[PDB]
Structure formats: C-alpha cells, structure tokens
From a paper:
Folick et al. further identified a [name] 8 ([name]) that mediates the retrograde signaling between lysosomal lipid hydrolysis and nuclear transcription. [name] is a member of a larger family of proteins termed the intracellular lipid-binding proteins (iLBPs), which includes both fatty acid binding proteins (FABPs), cellular retinoic acid binding proteins (CRABPs), and cellular retinoid binding proteins (CRBPs). Interestingly, [name] itself is also sufficient to prolong lifespan through activating NHR-49 and NHR-808. Here, we have expanded our knowledge of the FABP family by reporting the first structure of a [name] FABP, [name], and exploring its ligand specificity.
The [name] structure was solved in the C121 space group at high resolution (1.3 Å), with the asymmetric unit containing a monomer, which was consistent with size exclusion chromatography. The crystal structure includes all 137 amino acids of wild type [name], 92 waters, and two sulfate anions. [name] adopts a typical lipocalin fold, present in all FABPs, consisting of a N-terminal alpha helix-turn-helix motif lid (αA- αB) and a twisted beta barrel containing ten antiparallel strands (βA-βJ). The interior cavity is lined with polar and hydrophobic residues generating a solvent accessible surface area of 825 Å2 and volume of 1170 Å3. There are fragments of continuous electron density present throughout the pocket; however, we were unable to model in a fatty acid with confidence. We do predict that fatty acid is binding to [name] based on lipid MS data, therefore, the fragmented electron density likely reflects that only a fraction of the [name] in the crystal bound to fatty acid, or the fatty acid does not adopt a preferred conformation in the pocket. A network of eleven waters are present in the putative lipid binding pocket and anchored via hydrogen bonds with amino acids glutamine 56 and arginine 132. The [name] structure contains two lysines (K24 and K34) and an arginine (R33) present in the alpha helical lid, and a hydrophobic patch (25-IGVGLLI-32) within the turn region, suggesting [name] is a “collisional” FABP, and directly interacts with membranes or membrane proteins to acquire fatty acids. The interior cavity of [name] is lined with hydrophobic residues (F19, F60, L65, F67, F73, F94, F110, T112, and F134), which can stabilize fatty acyl tails of fatty acids via hydrophobic interactions. The absence of these conserved amino acids and having large pocket volume suggest that fatty acids can bind variably, possibly explaining why there was such diversity in our lipid MS data and disordered electron density within the interior of the crystal structure.
Residue numbers in the entry: 0 to 137
Write the structure that this text describes.
C-alpha cells in the first residue's frame, strides 16, 4: 500500500507478455485481431489531468485511450469495440479496473496495474485466464 499514484505517471514500454492472446480469445476476440494485437509491443502512457486519469496505449495496430476518475463508474468503449460498465479504484498501491459486461454473451475482466522495483506490471483476468505483462520506463 506504500506506492503512491504519482509513481505511475510516465511512459512505459512492453518488455514481456504471457497469455495475452489467450486472454483475448477468452473475452471473445477473433483470431486475426487477437494475433495482430498480441504481436505488438505497445507504449503505455499514464497521465493525470486535474482529477482525470488517462491510460493511453499506443501501438501500430490500435491506439486505445482510456480516461476515468477513480471510484466513478463509467461506460467504457473497450478496444474490442464492445461497451462495458467499468470502475477503477486505487487499493493498496494498485490500480484495479473492474470491466463489467453489459450483454450477457460478453465477458467481464479485471485489470490490475502495479509497480515493482521500478517496473510496471499488469494482469488482465477473465474467466479461467490471467494474462501477465511487464513494462519498463521509456
């Protein structure tokens, strides 16, 4: 719980990934898209504008910009082009996003972003699948 929110601010480059394509398959992404999305090494930019956070992911395949306020539910248009009811909290040093499905045939996910020894780590969880990603400061 020691890590402060401000330590996340900056630009981060993907250096390792595990189970990302499998995570995308689990949440219903088609083969061509999940293959292409998993081949990239995106840059994640985290910035704070007043009380609005921005987690923007940039890559050759798609740019994904997410804006939110902590503790405030919002409708997220996720990169899979489906809409979700998303809620991001900051708990014990970590950003936790609950991306809740709206349509019953969709899938919900939990995203956790945290810092360890200068690196930024993420997990994306849905159903039986957890994806793990690691980033280094740009």
């Amino acid at each position: 719980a020691m890590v402060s929110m401000k330590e996340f601010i900056g630009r981060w480059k993907l250096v390792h990934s595990e189970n990302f394509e499998e995570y995308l398959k689990e949440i219903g992404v088609g083969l061509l898209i999940r293959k292409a999305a998993s081949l990239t090494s995106p840059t994640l930019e985290i910035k704070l504008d007043g009380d609005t956070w921005h987690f923007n992911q940039y890559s050759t395949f798609k740019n994904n910009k997410l804006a939110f306020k902590i503790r405030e539910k919002f409708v997220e248009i996720a990169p899979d082009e489906r809409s979700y009811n998303t809620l991001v909290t900051f708990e014990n040093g970590k950003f936790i996003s609950h991306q809740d499905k709206i349509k019953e045939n969709h899938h919900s996910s939990v995203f956790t972003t945290w810092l360890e020894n200068g690196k930024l780590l993420q997990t994306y969880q849905s159903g039986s699948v957890i994806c793990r990603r690691e980033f280094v400061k740009e």
